[PDB]
Amino acid sequence: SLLVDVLELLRPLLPSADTELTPDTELFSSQLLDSLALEEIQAAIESRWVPLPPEELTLANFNTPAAIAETIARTST
Amino acid sequence: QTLHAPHSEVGCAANVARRVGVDLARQVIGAHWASRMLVREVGTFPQPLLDRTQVTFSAQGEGWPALLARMTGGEVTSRHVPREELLSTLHADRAEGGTLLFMEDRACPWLDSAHSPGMLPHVVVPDGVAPDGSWQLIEGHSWWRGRYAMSEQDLLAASYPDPDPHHVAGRVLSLRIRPSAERAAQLDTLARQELAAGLRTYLAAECGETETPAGRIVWANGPQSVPLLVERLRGWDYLCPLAARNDLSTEHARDVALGRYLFLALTDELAFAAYARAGTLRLVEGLGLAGAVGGLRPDEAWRLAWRSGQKLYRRLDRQNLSALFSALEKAAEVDVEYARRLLKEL
Amino acid sequence: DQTLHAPHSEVGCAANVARRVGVDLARQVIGAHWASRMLVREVGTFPQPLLDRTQVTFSAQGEGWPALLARMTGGEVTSRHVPREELLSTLHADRAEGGTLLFMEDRACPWLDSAHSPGMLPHVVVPDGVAPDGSWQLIEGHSWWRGRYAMSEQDLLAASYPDPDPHHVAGRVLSLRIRPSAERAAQLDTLARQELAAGLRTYLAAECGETETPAGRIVWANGPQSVPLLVERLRGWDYLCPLAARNDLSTEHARDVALGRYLFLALTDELAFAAYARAGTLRLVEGLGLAGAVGGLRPDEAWRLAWRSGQKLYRRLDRQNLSALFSALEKAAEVDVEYARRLLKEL
């Protein structure tokens, strides 16, 4: 649901139209995405859900679509 | 949960502080309200390490080593330990707090930096030997935050690299910081007193300068620090049209690389400001003082500045540079009103 | 040429001002100050907000010309900011007692072809009276652009008061009020011979030092040890060679290469100064009648070959060019210590 919104947000950032993206796909530790993609994700969260402070910007929070969805859920109460 | 911060060493110190019952972000960082513009510029010739005019910001003030030492009655000591004493030092420091152990980025597999020692050395906190003989290392930088395993031989190799561009050779900060029972009982009293003192320092708005082999270093504290910083940063407006060109000379490519790095470094200081201000608000809440400041949110104002900085170093253009200056001016305004209201209640 | 020059702008500028008051800077002031120092900026006590990177360089400037020029002349080399409506009167007042290094951005000096950047550091020029059309004559002290250039009074005031002002040059003058008294003028070659001994003794004393600053811990080492320590430290940047060889660099890895190459460019510029300074010492020694006793060693040539090696490395960051820079620096170090010992014996 958020996971659906996160997967929708990420697909157009990937290296290829056919890049496999599941809820457990590694995004940053794999160098699939770089920090210009992280900026797009931060800016999407800022405008759609609850803006994230620096303490939320961790590889544990951002490395998979499931982790991003969990981050937005946790931070949107 | 591993504690962390926008600066690796602060994250590391927060983990060590928790071992001895000290909440570093709230009682040490959050108790030290600060705002400083720093400049390195041409002073008296010769200054062979002055490579460029440089400007940044700091919300660290005197810094956690000074405050953590006087608040605990302990010591935070820098040493280059001989290899034959490193492991004994790591075991000995653990009784009374712990150690920040420096190493190159390329010694830390989780940094994905095999091909470079990085601009500066990294730091970790050794957190004991596990059942299998391997060291547990705490990573205190928010992005990589967590616990990692390293073999003892790999740890010693990391402490004594060859070559050693950063001079990491047995470099430790030993935190012998365990408070007495009577001091532990009063940490929030000391935090209250440090909070008032830093607020008075801020309003005193001292400035200074020093001539060094790396340049004249100038600093300015207090309510005008961020206005002065913004006025100075306008001097880097040339980066916008220069970063848009696609055919840059080696020298112009260096100007852009160094200019982007100035805003990257600044952005990490803005992240730290948001972290520190959040600590201040947790401190004020726990002291029962949240009443007298109302709902002012200097943490949120600095968070907005940090985001403007990230946008600018990621894409150097005039709109992004103007947005950073606006966010910084807003943070300056919220800071001075918050500081004045809070000191009135102390 | 009609104008004196050096590999550092401000040194060339100072040489022109010194000549006005009967001081040969390169021979009597730079050449009288034998020095060799390794400098490093590294991590020290937190926090250090201006420490952006570990940095290593070299200097043969020692205490530097402002210190030596001021004490040898009995005058002053003083930095200050003056308001726009007092700048021209300050330039005339300084001229009556020496001269001025006037700060300005690179982009204000058309002869530098630097319109699109204020550069990493500000520039300096020496005001040198006016041309027949009333334009100010500006001496360029850097060898690469050596000469005198005209700038209208309106343009010179616009250059001295830039907006914005990244380098803080606004109305900044380094005033060289350096004309020696008649009595002091007659003592200059005596004071130069004293300074020459005193720097060689400082070099052989090989002191070290370390300061903690908001820009890092600054470590230095003087003397015969200085170049060997520098070479040992610069080996830490061997990682640049494989990195600059790779074709697809992240913004991050591009930055690391750019900053590393800039470390070698700054170092190369200090090798040019060493060659200049050593040549000055050889001139000072020749004029004191000591060249025959001291012998035919050429530390100037050894530092010039180190400079060429540095430029070669700056153009192509490869392990062979790095090793060639290290060999050149080691050879310069060996000539320096043999020369220093033979000269100090004859003084």
DSSP A43-67: HHHHHHS-PPPGGG--HHHHSSHHH
**Are C166 and C210 in the same domain?**
no
Assess B91–A contact: CB distance below 8 Å, yes or no. no
Experimentally, the structure was elucidated by X-ray
Angstrom distances, CA of residue B277 to CA of A77, B183, B265, B298: 22, 25, 19, 6
Give the residues across from C176 on adjacent strands: C77, C99
Chain C residue numbers touching B51 (CB-CB < 8 A):
55, 120-121, 262, 266
Tell me, yes or no, whether B339 lies in a domain. Answer: yes
What DSSP element (H or E) covers C56?
strand C55-59
Domain with C145, as residue range(s), is 9-27+76-177
Q: Which residues are CB-neighbours of C8 under 8 A, at least 6 positions away? A: C142, C269, C273
Tell me, yes or no, whether C273 lies in a domain. Answer: yes
Chain C residue numbers touching B252 (CB-CB < 8 A):
116-117
Task: With beta carbons less than 8 A apart as the criterion, state whether B173 and B76 touch.
Answer: yes
**Are B163 and B81 in the same domain?**
yes
Vertex B145 angle, CA B140 and B151, to 5°:
85
Of C182, C319, C253, C229, nearest to C36 (Cα)? C229
Angstrom distances, CA of residue C184 to CA of B101, C22, C72, C197, C311: 57, 11, 8, 19, 41
Reported residue count of chain C is: 347
Assess B143–C contact: CB distance below 8 Å, yes or no. no
For residue C151, give the 3-state DSSP assignment: strand
Which superfamily is assigned to A2-75 in CATH? Answer: ACP-like (1.10.1200.10)
Tell me, yes or no, whether B3 lies in a domain. Answer: no
Phi, psi of A45 (to 5 degrees): -65, -45
Task: With beta carbons less than 8 A apart as the criterion, state whether B93 and C160 touch.
Answer: no
Of C326, C249, C281, nearest to C56 (Cα)? C326
Angstrom distances, CA of residue B168 to CA of B78, B84, B119, C90, C117: 12, 15, 13, 49, 36
Angstrom distances, CA of residue B118 to CA of B43, C30, C260: 29, 37, 11
Q: Which residues are CB-neighbours of B146 under 8 A, at least 6 positions away? A: A60, B2, B110, B139
Chain B residue numbers touching C41 (CB-CB < 8 A):
49, 214
Angstrom distances, CA of residue C304 to CA of B248, B317, C181: 29, 42, 37
* Closest CA–CA distance from residue B148 to any residue of chain A (Å): 13
Tell me, yes or no, whether C233 lies in a domain. Answer: yes
Cα–Cα distance measured from residue C34 to residue C268, given in angstroms and rounded to the nearest whole number = 19
Assess C122–B contact: CB distance below 8 Å, yes or no. yes
* Closest CA–CA distance from residue A45 to any residue of chain B (Å): 12
Q: Which residues are CB-neighbours of C183 under 8 A, at least 6 positions away? A: none
Assess A39–B contact: CB distance below 8 Å, yes or no. yes
Residue C207 Rama label (left phi>0; alpha psi -120 to 50; beta): beta
Tell me, yes or no, whether C60 lies in a domain. Answer: yes
> Nearest-CA residue of chain A relative to B145?
A58
CA C50 to chain centre: 23
> Nearest-CA residue of chain C relative to B63?
C47
Is the backbone peptide bond immediately before A15 cis, with ω within 30 degrees of 0? no
Binding partners of A (≥3 Cβ pairs within 8 A): B
Angstrom distances, CA of residue B43 to CA of A38, B39, C207: 40, 11, 24
**How many domains are contained in chain C?**
2
DSSP at C290: -
Reported residue count of chain B is: 346
Chain C residue numbers touching B116 (CB-CB < 8 A):
239, 243, 253, 256
Residues 183-202 of C with CB under 8 A from B: none
Angstrom distances, CA of residue C238 to CA of C231, C256, C260, C297, C325: 11, 12, 10, 32, 12
> What is the rounded radius of gyration, in angstroms, for the C-alpha atoms of chain C?
21
**Are C199 and C59 in the same domain?**
yes
Q: Which of residues C125, C148, C177 is at a domain's end?
A: C177
Q: Which residues are CB-neighbours of B295 under 8 A, at least 6 positions away? A: none
Cα–Cα distance measured from residue C124 to residue C11, given in angstroms and rounded to the nearest whole number = 10
For residue C138, give the 3-state DSSP assignment: strand
Angstrom distances, CA of residue C285 to CA of A22, B41, B47, C193, C293: 78, 36, 27, 9, 10
Assess C36–B contact: CB distance below 8 Å, yes or no. no
Tell me, yes or no, whether B48 lies in a domain. Answer: yes
**Are C209 and C148 in the same domain?**
no
Assess B265–C contact: CB distance below 8 Å, yes or no. yes
**Are C149 and C213 in the same domain?**
no
Task: With beta carbons less than 8 A apart as the criterion, state whether C294 and C343 touch.
Answer: yes
**Are B243 and B119 in the same domain?**
no
**Are B48 and B98 in the same domain?**
no
**Are C160 and C131 in the same domain?**
yes
Using the Cα atoms of residue C179, residue C182, residue C183 and residue C189 in order, give the sign of their dihedral: positive
CA B146 to chain centre: 18
Resolution for this PDB entry, in angstroms: 1.5
Sheet holding B75-80, edge to edge: B75-80, B171-176, B97-103, B122-129, B135-139, B146-150
Chain B residue numbers touching C46 (CB-CB < 8 A):
9, 60, 63-65, 173
Binding residues of A for (R)-4'-phosphopantetheine: 35
Using the Cα atoms of residue B241, residue B244, residue B249 and residue B250 in order, give the sign of their dihedral: positive
Chain B residue numbers touching C54 (CB-CB < 8 A):
119-121, 165-167
Task: With beta carbons less than 8 A apart as the criterion, state whether C143 and C15 touch.
Answer: no
DSSP at A28: T
Task: With beta carbons less than 8 A apart as the criterion, state whether B14 and B126 touch.
Answer: no
Assess B236–C contact: CB distance below 8 Å, yes or no. yes
* Closest CA–CA distance from residue C46 to any residue of chain B (Å): 7
CB contact under 8 A, A58 and B4: yes
**Are C61 and C131 in the same domain?**
no
Cα–Cα distance measured from residue B100 to residue B102, given in angstroms and rounded to the nearest whole number = 7
Question: What is the domain partition of chain A in residue ranges?
Answer: 2-75
Tell me, yes or no, whether B311 lies in a domain. Answer: yes
**Are C168 and C211 in the same domain?**
no
Tell me, yes or no, whether C201 lies in a domain. Answer: yes
Cα–Cα distance measured from residue C264 to residue C107, given in angstroms and rounded to the nearest whole number = 24
**Are C104 and C159 in the same domain?**
yes
Assess A47–B contact: CB distance below 8 Å, yes or no. no
